[PDB]
């Protein structure tokens, strides 16, 4: 296994409403400006906020900006709103597998991909999660799957691209998670496989097009907990 490894070695800020905010993130190579950010809500949806370093996604207000180059990026919000609390995560989209780093959790001081529901499995066992996309572009898009464990930042499984089935996975992945899809109930699908403890954690399908490394539209995630 081999990649470029991101860091947020701030793992939690505490501000008041109005303040100036930034989430710092390094990674351990020049990553020559392809850094997105993402913001997870307090229910757990995912939204992509930042492409390349600095591109504001539609509908992203102004307050928000992102800036570095080389490994290290930083995004700022400015006056601080409520909306805005959530952890903050980047993502590398220069060298696949894609990664991301641990997030920075902020707090204040005193969907179009339809996941399958909460799964509670043994070890030993597996299990098959779905993704149904209520869109038109599933089977001209890919297909990510991304894993979230408590305190484990963010990271990519694989992507599959129904047009004609081609697969990618992580070399960390690969014998656990078999990726699938079906092109006439736009379904995508992930099985996991000889589970054990390290296999429970959420895990989230996301979309993206076939010419930017982010992650567009984000499931709900799918909770799979593993237990003896």
């Known amino acids: 296994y081999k990649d470029i490894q991101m860091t947020q070695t701030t793992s939690s800020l505490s501000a008041s409403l109005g303040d100036r905010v930034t989430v710092s993130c390094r990674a351990s190579?020049?990553?020559?400006?392809?850094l997105n950010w993402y913001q997870q809500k307090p229910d757990g949806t995912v939204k992509f906020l930042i492409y390349?370093?600095?591109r504001l996604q539609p509908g992203v207000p102004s307050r928000f900006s992102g800036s570095g180059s080389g490994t290290d990026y930083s995004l700022t919000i400015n006056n601080l709103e409520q909306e805005d609390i959530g952890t903050y995560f980047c993502?590398?989209?220069?060298?696949?597998?894609?990664?991301f780093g641990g997030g920075t959790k902020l707090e204040i001081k005193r969907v179009q991909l339809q996941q399958s529901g909460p799964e509670l499995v043994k070890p030993g066992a597996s299990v098959k999660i779905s993704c149904k996309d209520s869109?038109?572009?599933?089977?001209?898009?890919?297909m990510n799957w991304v894993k979230q464990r408590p305190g484990q930042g963010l990271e990519w499984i694989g992507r599959?691209?129904?047009?004609?089935?081609?697969?990618n996975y992580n070399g960390k992945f690969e014998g656990k998670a078999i990726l699938t899809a079906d092109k006439s109930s736009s379904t995508a699908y992930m099985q996991l496989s000889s589970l054990t403890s390290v296999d429970s954690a959420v895990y989230f399908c996301?979309?993206?097009?076939?010419?930017?490394?982010?992650?567009?539209?984000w499931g709900q995630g799918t909770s799979v907990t593993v237990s003896s």
């Open positions: 390349y370093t600095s």
């Open positions: 190579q020049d990553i020559r400006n392809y």
């Open positions: 993502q590398q989209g220069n060298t696949p597998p894609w990664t």
């Open positions: 869109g038109y572009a599933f089977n001209s898009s890919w």
């Open positions: 996301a979309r993206s097009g076939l010419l930017r490394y982010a992650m567009d539209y």
């Open positions: 599959i691209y129904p047009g004609d089935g081609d697969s």
